[PDB]
Every structure is written in structure tokens, then in C-alpha cells.
Design an enzyme around this catalytic site. Structure first.
Site, PDB file in Angstrom:
ATOM      1  N   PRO A 162       4.999   1.337 -10.677  1.00  0.00           N
ATOM      2  CA  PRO A 162       6.101   1.556  -9.723  1.00  0.00           C
ATOM      3  C   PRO A 162       6.629   3.008  -9.646  1.00  0.00           C
ATOM      4  O   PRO A 162       6.770   3.536  -8.536  1.00  0.00           O
ATOM      5  CB  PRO A 162       7.174   0.576 -10.208  1.00  0.00           C
ATOM      6  CG  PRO A 162       6.353  -0.577 -10.768  1.00  0.00           C
ATOM      7  CD  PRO A 162       5.185   0.103 -11.459  1.00  0.00           C
ATOM      8  N   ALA A 170     -19.841  -0.125  11.677  1.00  0.00           N
ATOM      9  CA  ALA A 170     -20.744   0.262  10.594  1.00  0.00           C
ATOM     10  C   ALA A 170     -20.898  -0.806   9.502  1.00  0.00           C
ATOM     11  O   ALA A 170     -22.002  -1.050   9.012  1.00  0.00           O
ATOM     12  CB  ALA A 170     -20.289   1.590   9.981  1.00  0.00           C
ATOM     13  N   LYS A 222      -5.689   6.608  11.504  1.00  0.00           N
ATOM     14  CA  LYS A 222      -5.626   6.374  10.063  1.00  0.00           C
ATOM     15  C   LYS A 222      -6.242   7.580   9.362  1.00  0.00           C
ATOM     16  O   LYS A 222      -7.410   7.921   9.596  1.00  0.00           O
ATOM     17  CB  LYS A 222      -6.361   5.080   9.683  1.00  0.00           C
ATOM     18  CG  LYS A 222      -6.174   4.695   8.207  1.00  0.00           C
ATOM     19  CD  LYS A 222      -6.856   3.371   7.907  1.00  0.00           C
ATOM     20  CE  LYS A 222      -8.378   3.494   7.797  1.00  0.00           C
ATOM     21  NZ  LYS A 222      -8.844   4.398   6.689  1.00  0.00           N
ATOM     22  N   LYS A 249      -4.288   3.653  -0.246  1.00  0.00           N
ATOM     23  CA  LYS A 249      -4.619   2.551  -1.163  1.00  0.00           C
ATOM     24  C   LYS A 249      -3.762   2.614  -2.427  1.00  0.00           C
ATOM     25  O   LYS A 249      -4.283   2.525  -3.548  1.00  0.00           O
ATOM     26  CB  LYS A 249      -6.094   2.622  -1.578  1.00  0.00           C
ATOM     27  CG  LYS A 249      -7.104   2.621  -0.443  1.00  0.00           C
ATOM     28  CD  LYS A 249      -7.243   1.233   0.113  1.00  0.00           C
ATOM     29  CE  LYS A 249      -8.451   1.079   1.049  1.00  0.00           C
ATOM     30  NZ  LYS A 249      -8.450   2.136   2.117  1.00  0.00           N
TER      31      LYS A 249
END
Ligand SMILES: O=c1cc(O)n([C@@H]2O[C@H](COP(=O)(O)O)[C@@H](O)[C@H]2O)c(=O)[nH]1
Ligand SMILES: O=c1cc(O)n([C@@H]2O[C@H](COP(=O)(O)O)[C@@H](O)[C@H]2O)c(=O)[nH]1
Lengths: 220, 220
Positions: A71, A178, A36, A66
Site C-alpha cells: 500500500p 495480435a 493507453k 500494473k
């Protein structure tokens, strides 16, 4: 029918310089095939880092951007992201269905996947997102979304997300290590765990990854 | 005091190649000293596009990154963005107070500004964001946020946002032109309007900007 993630473990590569990011990823490459990559690395080193990861590691790349715009802008973001070689992109559900659909359209056009983020793992998620999260997940189902992100830090919320989307959908989950989430408990509900700092800030990232995998070995 | 935006008009520069983006921005330079640069341009051309704009135009730069991650990642995004030379960054409020606070802390440390986005101008914003918007705004005020983004396409919502943040706060508003928002009506509540496609897709972007400014002449 779903993405096949080696060892059910996705590295969140949030180091912010190329040398460190490449070195640490190389150290753990035997354990993963999915990375990622988010804005900390991309805004520090450029979108070319994605193609470089593919050249060096032949790993799949999930662009954790994110996406959370209107749109028209979402479409442009997805196009730029997939042009850089990302296999998938993470999109917020909170801005609504049209903004998700814009991303789904571009992903279909370019042979990629959209992951819908429904509830976040951080404490502030309780304020506004959590109360909408089940509805966001149902919206995902209505839109034909097959890939989801939900929080390791709240296993009861992660289980509910799994219930909504069904066993056939693909679910990945950050907040392991974490932030306090447990790898094994998270994999009761998620197909794969996302792990960043517990690996990339470790003295020995390879040992850190190996240790996590040992703890879930009977789930592999 | 607040940033002094020339002609109360901010260009949303969402063209995706350097040459066109530079050309159009230069063409409207006599009308606009404040440019909003987002991910369509940054993900296409790199963060050095900010440097190039500063070199060519000396315009203020608002990084429209709709920051929407956990606190730790938000910090990293803000650090990278301000390091590149952005005067300000736009942050989503829906992920909660901790995520906004992380951005404010970085902006304070680095001598830059956060703009809080409370509700969006696109249709789907009604699904989840709208109902949280007054509370997101109030949260901003409680956190000491001084700069806000609200939707021109929903005058009732924009006016309520202005009420909540007070007359001393700074409010900018997109959705003018292509999305249907009216410049004069929007400026009843916003300090400045954000305009993208109406200007950057025009045969003559300078004439388009001049025309918008002529329509709001008595408000300057
Ligand atoms: O709800 C979410 C969604 C995320 O994408 N993430 C992302 O997952 C990663 C978690 O990393 P870490 O293991 O260092 O906590 C970060 O890249 C973060 O931005 C998260 O922590 N919570
Ligand atoms: O609610 C919002 C918040 C935005 O930042 N924007 C941004 O403002 C700009 C609007 O551009 P346009 O004038 O072409 O519609 C785009 O960059 C978009 O991402 C918006 O349209 N609505």
C-alpha cells in the site's frame, strides 16, 4: 457516469521511441480520443511524454502501470503518475484489497480513476490469476471500483467478469488482434477494446484503425 | 556465486526527489553497496536516476519494478531497464511462467539478473498471493531462477521459501523495520535484508544503518 471512449477503441501505445510514438498516434488521432501509455514508452522516454500527448492530441491518458506493490509504495506510484497528468491508472488486484485501496485513495484525491485488472490475457494467467479472478472482481465491487480490465482472449472469462461487475461498471479489454481476440466479440462484453500491435506495427496504422472500426461499426 | 551485498543490507531508496535521494544514499554509502530503486523514485526523476547513482556511489542497482505484464510487454520493460544500467530487476511470479520466462530470456541475453517475488510482506498478500506462493517459488526453481524476494513479516513463509529454493539460491527480504520485521530473525533465512523508511526517514540515516548493522554484527 462512465468514461466516454471514441469508437470504443483505446490505442495501446507501446512503441519505445518518442518520434515513432508521436507519429503513429498522430496518424490515428481522428479515430481515437483515449491512449493507453505503459512502461515500454514511459521507461524509454520519460514521464513527460504524458503531458506531451495531452498537448499534441488532447486525448485522455490511461497509465498502464500494473500497480502491484505494498500500500505505501502504491500510494507513491499513483501520486507520481497523476502528477504527470495521467487520467487513470491500471492496478493489479492479485496483491489484495489494501493495495487496491491505497490507489483508490490517491485517485479520489487527485480527480482520477482506478482500473482494476482481474485476469490477464496471456496464457500464463491460467496458472494463478484465473482461479482468483472472480474473487478479485467481487473484491473490486466491495471496494467500490467502477472500472475493470479483463481478457479478450477468453470471451467466456470476460463475460463472467461483466456478470460480476454489472452493466453499469466500465470494462476495457486487451488481447484484440495480435493476441487473437476478436474486436466484435469482445465488445459484446467490454465497453472498449484495447489495441496495440495490430495498429502500431501496421504498414498503415490509420488504415488498420479504420479497418477495425469498420468491423464493429454497427456496435458504435 | 551470488551478488556480494555489503553488510547484508540493501537500501530501499523510495524518496521521490533527486536531491533528497542522493543525499541520503551518500550518507549511508560506507555501510551499503547495494541499492534498490523503485517506481516512486524512477517515475519522479526518470530512468537517468540509475546513471546518477552509478556515477555518485558505484553501488549495485536493483530495479524494483515488480514486472507483472504479458510476456511481450515484460520483455520491453526488462530491455529498457537493463539499457539504463540496472544490475537486476524484480519480477512478479503470479502472472505465470511465460511472463517470468520472458524476463529471464532478456536478462540472459543482456547479462543481467532477475529476482522473483513470490509473496508480499503487506497484509493483503494473504488474500490471493500466499496460497500460490509455494507453487510460484517451485515454478521459479523449475525455470532456473536463482534470485528471490520473500517477506520478512511472515517468518514461516520466508523459511518455506528458503526450503523450496535451496541454500544456493539468493534470497532478499523486505518488511524490516517500518513493517515490523526483525533484522536478525530475517537473516536466519534471507541472504540480505531490504530496509527503507527506518533508514531514509531517520534524522541520521547513517546512524540508523549503523544501528541495524550493530544488531546483526555476529551474522556478518
Ligand atoms: O491482460 C492484459 C492486460 C494488459 O494491460 N495488456 C496490455 O494491453 C496491450 C496489448 O497490446 P497488443 O494489442 O499489442 O497485444 C499491451 O500494452 C499489454 O501490456 C495485455 O495485453 N493483457
Ligand atoms: O513484499 C514486499 C516486496 C517489496 O519489494 N517491498 C518493497 O520494499 C520496500 C520496503 O520499504 P520499508 O522498509 O520502508 O517498509 C519498499 O520499496 C517496498 O515497495 C515490500 O515492502 N514488500
Amino acid at each position: 457516469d462512465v468514461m466516454d471512449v471514441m469508437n470504443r477503441l483505446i490505442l495501446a501505445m507501446d512503441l519505445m521511441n518518442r518520434d515513432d510514438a508521436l507519429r503513429v498516434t498522430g496518424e490515428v488521432r481522428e479515430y481515437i480520443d483515449t491512449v493507453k501509455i505503459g512502461y515500454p514508452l514511459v521507461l524509454s522516454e520519460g514521464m513527460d511524454i504524458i503531458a506531451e500527448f495531452r498537448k499534441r492530441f488532447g486525448c485522455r491518458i490511461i497509465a498502464d502501470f500494473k500497480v502491484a506493490d505494498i500500500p505505501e509504495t502504491n500510494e507513491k506510484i499513483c501520486r507520481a503518475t497523476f502528477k504527470a497528468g495521467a487520467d487513470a491508472i491500471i492496478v493489479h488486484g492479485f496483491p489484495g484489497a489494501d493495495s487496491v485501496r491505497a490507489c483508490l485513495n490517491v485517485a479520489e484525491e487527485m480527480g482520477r480513476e482506478v482500473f482494476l485488472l482481474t485476469e490477464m490475457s496471456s496464457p500464463g494467467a491460467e496458472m494463478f490469476i484465473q482461479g482468483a479472478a472472480d474473487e478479485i472482481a467481487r473484491m473490486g465491487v466491495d471496494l467500490g471500483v467502477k472500472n475493470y480490465v479483463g481478457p479478450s482472449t477468453r470471451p467466456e472469462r470476460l463475460s463472467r467478469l461483466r456478470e460480476i461487475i454489472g452493466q453499469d461498471s466500465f470494462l476495457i479489454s486487451p488481447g484484440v488482434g495480435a493476441q487473437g481476440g476478436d474486436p466484435g466479440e469482445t465488445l459484446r462484453f467490454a465497453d472498449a477494446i484495447i489495441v496495440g500491435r495490430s495498429i502500431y506495427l501496421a504498414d498503415n496504422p490509420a488504415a488498420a484503425a479504420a479497418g477495425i472500426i469498420e468491423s464493429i461499426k454497427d456496435l458504435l
